Design an enzyme around this catalytic site. Structure first.
Site, short mmCIF file in Angstrom:
data_model
loop_
_atom_site.label_atom_id
_atom_site.label_comp_id
_atom_site.label_asym_id
_atom_site.label_seq_id
_atom_site.Cartn_x
_atom_site.Cartn_y
_atom_site.Cartn_z
N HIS A 166 0.91 -1.12 0.00
CA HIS A 166 0.00 0.00 0.00
C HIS A 166 0.94 1.16 0.00
O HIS A 166 2.11 1.00 0.33
CB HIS A 166 -0.85 0.02 1.26
CG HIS A 166 -1.96 -0.98 1.25
ND1 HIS A 166 -1.73 -2.34 1.32
CD2 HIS A 166 -3.30 -0.83 1.16
CE1 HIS A 166 -2.89 -2.98 1.27
NE2 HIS A 166 -3.85 -2.09 1.16
N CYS A 268 -4.13 0.69 12.30
CA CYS A 268 -4.99 0.44 13.46
C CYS A 268 -5.88 1.52 14.00
O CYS A 268 -6.50 1.33 15.04
CB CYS A 268 -4.16 -0.11 14.60
SG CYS A 268 -3.51 -1.73 14.27
C1 LIG Z 1 -0.03 0.99 5.93
C2 LIG Z 1 -1.00 0.02 5.24
C3 LIG Z 1 -0.36 -1.36 5.08
C4 LIG Z 1 -1.32 -2.32 4.36
C5 LIG Z 1 -2.60 -2.53 5.17
N1 LIG Z 1 -3.76 -2.06 4.70
N2 LIG Z 1 -2.55 -3.14 6.35
C6 LIG Z 1 -3.76 -3.36 7.15
C7 LIG Z 1 -4.69 -4.39 6.50
C8 LIG Z 1 -4.14 -5.81 6.66
C9 LIG Z 1 -5.17 -6.86 6.23
N3 LIG Z 1 -4.70 -8.20 6.62
C10 LIG Z 1 -5.35 -6.82 4.71
O1 LIG Z 1 -4.92 -7.80 4.06
O2 LIG Z 1 -5.93 -5.83 4.22
#
Ligand SMILES: CCCCC(=N)NCCC[C@H](N)C(=O)O
Length: 275
Positions: A166, A268
């Site tokens: 991301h 979070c």
């Molecule tokens: C800084 C953002 C890093 C990427 C992100 N959205 N992380 C949070 C979501 C993780 C969740 N397991 C997914 O597969 O969407």
């Protein structure tokens, strides 16, 4: 009330099912759900107990193993909230309790409905002067396009984010005009693409570990500049870099367990500034 100022933060308990069903790009070691709780507990503790931010603790939903990474479901700019349509399908129902919470917070809601528009908040960098939406496996044209429309007060430019990353997997605001960025050539490239399309030059805090570039800045009163970064233990070479900023109250925060399922600090929580 300057850039990074907040009064509220929206969080959500992580479900037990996250341990084995939370979407994860890489297959790593087993997730110790217990440690994740401990880490997540401290995380909210820092935002609320320690920084006075009014915290809204949404209850966990077992069927939504990713309900904990609330930042992907919504993006709040000033007084307007944009509930997104997650790049991942199994995460779509997280919008319910989130629209519910923001509604209770009297925020102007704008729902992303378009059946062809995906946008994960994680791909969005609000520099406090403009937006940077990463076009990735989670976010497309329509996504940024609808978001640009929702926030006509700010310029929105899109930057190519490759793989299962991301935009914020390698950057985030470490302060006013300060963009935390990773050393990776991919990271540095993404960055350069960014400033080219901007009118002002942002100062950059480069960190060896790309994921450590993901952190939280806050302008908390009686405190000033606040930055929650990854602990020296998890990323010493990156933590040592954050250590040199003496104008920022540095608060180390571990995220190893949730990182096992691509979850970083910013992920979070949603920071709202209700004045
Ligand atoms: C800084 C953002 C890093 C990427 C992100 N959205 N992380 C949070 C979501 C993780 C969740 N397991 C997914 O597969 O969407």
């Amino acid at each position: 009330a300057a850039f990074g100022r907040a009064t509220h933060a929206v969080v959500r308990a992580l479900p037990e099912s996250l341990g084995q069903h939370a979407l994860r790009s890489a297959k790593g070691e087993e997730v110790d759900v217990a440690r994740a709780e401990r880490q997540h507990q401290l995380y909210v503790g820092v935002l609320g107990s320690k920084l006075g931010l009014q915290v809204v603790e949404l209850p966990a939903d077992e069927s939504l193993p990713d309900c904990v990474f609330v930042e992907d479901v919504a993006v709040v700019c000033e007084e307007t909230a944009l509930i997104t349509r997650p790049g991942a399908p199994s995460r779509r129902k997280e919008v319910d309790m989130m629209k519910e919470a923001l509604e209770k917070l009297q925020l102007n809601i704008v729902e992303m409905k378009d059946e062809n528009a995906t946008l994960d908040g994680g791909d969005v960098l609000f520099t406090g002067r403009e937006f940077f939406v990463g076009l990735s496996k989670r976010t497309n044209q329509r996504g940024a396009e609808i978001l640009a429309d929702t926030f006509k007060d700010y310029a929105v430019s899109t930057v190519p984010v490759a793989d299962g990353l991301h935009l914020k997997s390698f950057c985030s605001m470490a302060g006013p005009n300060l963009i935390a960025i990773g050393s990776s050539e991919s990271a540095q490239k993404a960055l350069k693409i960014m400033q080219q399309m901007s009118d002002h030059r942002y100062d950059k805090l480069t960190v060896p570990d790309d994921i450590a570039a993901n952190c939280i800045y806050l302008n908390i009163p009686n405190k000033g500049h606040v930055l929650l970064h990854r602990t020296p233990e998890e990323y010493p070479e990156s933590a040592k870099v954050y250590e040199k900023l003496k104008d920022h109250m540095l608060i180390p925060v571990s995220m190893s367990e949730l990182e096992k399922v691509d979850g970083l600090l910013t992920s979070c929580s949603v920071l709202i500034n209700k004045k």
